[PDB]
Design a protein around this nucleic acid. Sequence first.
DNA 1: CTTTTTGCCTAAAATGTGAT
DNA 2: CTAGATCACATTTTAGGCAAAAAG
DNA 3: CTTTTTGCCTAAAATGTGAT
DNA 4: CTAGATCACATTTTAGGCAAAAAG
Lengths: 74, 74, 203, 203
Amino acid sequence: FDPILLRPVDDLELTVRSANCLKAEAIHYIGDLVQRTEVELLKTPNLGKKSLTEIKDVLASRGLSLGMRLENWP
Amino acid sequence: FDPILLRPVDDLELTVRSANCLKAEAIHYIGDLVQRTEVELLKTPNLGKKSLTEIKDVLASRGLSLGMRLENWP
Amino acid sequence: TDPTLEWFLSHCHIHKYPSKSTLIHQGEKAETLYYIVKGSVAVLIKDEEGKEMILSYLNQGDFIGELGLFEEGQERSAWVRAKTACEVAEISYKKFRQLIQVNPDILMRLSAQMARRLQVTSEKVGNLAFLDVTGRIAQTLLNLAKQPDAMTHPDGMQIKITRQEIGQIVGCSRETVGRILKMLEDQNLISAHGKTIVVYGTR
Amino acid sequence: TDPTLEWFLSHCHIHKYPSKSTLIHQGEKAETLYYIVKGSVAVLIKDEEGKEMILSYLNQGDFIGELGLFEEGQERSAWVRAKTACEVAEISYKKFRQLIQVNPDILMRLSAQMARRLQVTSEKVGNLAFLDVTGRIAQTLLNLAKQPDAMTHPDGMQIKITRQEIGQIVGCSRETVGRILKMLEDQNLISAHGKTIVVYGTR
DNA sequence: CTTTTTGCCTAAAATGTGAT
DNA sequence: CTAGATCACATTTTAGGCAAAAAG
DNA sequence: CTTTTTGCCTAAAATGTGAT
DNA sequence: CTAGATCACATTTTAGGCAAAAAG
Ligand SMILES: Nc1ncnc2c1ncn2[C@@H]1O[C@@H]2COP(=O)(O)O[C@H]2[C@H]1O
Ligand SMILES: Nc1ncnc2c1ncn2[C@@H]1O[C@@H]2COP(=O)(O)O[C@H]2[C@H]1O
């Protein structure tokens, strides 16, 4: 398993705009985010290039990224 | 002009075998040698790979080589 | 924080290049070294007629314009042109040398990159010597899912590029690149709609 | 006398390689650097089927087997095979590094050669991307008059090579290389009799 | 006497052919 | 359209080691 | 009020076509 | 033989700057 992937989306300290799209797409835990793809996220209403970019950068300074392929979930 | 090219073949200190083919081909001065080609020299009787090689090496440690293209002669 | 690169920079002139602007003209006198601080550029060469050809893209972190640095009065070997808008570190042949003998680690980092580049370039030769055109395309499609600007996409990695360009990469006509892409689409290897492409099965 | 190279050597194992013997197998683990003391070698790569391709010949003075020296556990990128019989200096990745920080001049000499090699290799790509086969041959015939083992010859520089090989160089069939040579002979550009060839107008 | 050139030799490698 | 690849095999060419011959 | 997403817009660039 | 190049031009696609709209 891995430790950071069991934390809520809240532990990323996002902006209100980024926070509000995630919590309305049923993305509750950080482990759920890293599995999701870049293109997929972008389709979601109210989420454009800058929010997608904030998501990619809060993950990158913290080791993670998008489109990751994971096992053993829940 | 150039200085070494006006010296006799003798100033190269060759072996008797190399010396004897040059003096029988009407190659008297070192300026005449550097103009002559590698393949051309090899056709000449009594001159084989090792003599051709001695000629190329006595010229190389002394700046010169074969197949050189020269002006102002005599 | 990274000290070796940080110190290096403390000795450079920074200059912004607008997209598609030309950073290095093949043939010019070479006296200067460049370093990609941000962006991506295109390395290409040209024949007499003007037909173009892409050697490799370089990205943030990569060096450019080095080849003249070892023998004097050498001339630039290829165009290097800004793919995006770039911010570029610049430093002179004169001064870079003074730097080496102060911290050779820095010469190492350049040299590290040199080697990798020979491997890529050598390989591309192989692509050309051994593979058919349908094939050379394939290799290049995979290499792209490796790039930074590549997007994660459900079926595999997604990329944005033109057919015209692909030609400057794989060395064939643009008409031809189009033809294979309609075939690779029947063969469910890719999803191609516009400059927009899905490379199945990478990632 | 040349001190920098002389000192370098004082730290190497010397080994003789018989002609046509293989010095480096593409793919092997890389932990060692080689240096050509005497002779000439052939740098080539292979496809799955076994078709071969010549990147460049290296001669006395040239370095080989370096590409793994910058990232760890890298694998050899191509065959390197003895063209003549060679006498070869050998030195480890471990120890070469210890040397750099003792005299970076030596890293420079390697690096100098690295750059030139990228230029040649890049160019060969150009040969392939831009020139027809009749053309690629031509470039390669001229490059040969540049080599050490090239002989001065009245009409131009003389070389000894097979058609089969030329193919591994220019990337075409041996049958094809033969055909152009009979044409280049009508066109009084060359004199071809055996492995023996006269390249008119070089020198 | 030695050193170096030349002719001589055969298995193995290199080559032309040419319609599709 | 054009420029090359391809096949098998009868014939040609090369490498290179030795010995006789010539030169020193 | 600001910041960010979305739809909208046109000249300029990219493309398919297909017989030889 | 097979795999690509080639032509001009009618139609399609993209870049990217702005404004209205939505979110905070
Ligand atoms: N094959 C290659 N792959 C990647 N980058 C290259 C290649 N060839 C040249 N370059 C770069 O393009 C630059 C062109 O000019 P320089 O010779 O000054 O330095 C060159 C390198 O930085
Ligand atoms: N394009 C090239 N031109 C000249 N030499 C090369 C080229 N590519 C590889 N080499 C050499 O071939 C070697 C193969 O193994 P290495 O990767 O250890 O190091 C490589 C270089 O020394």
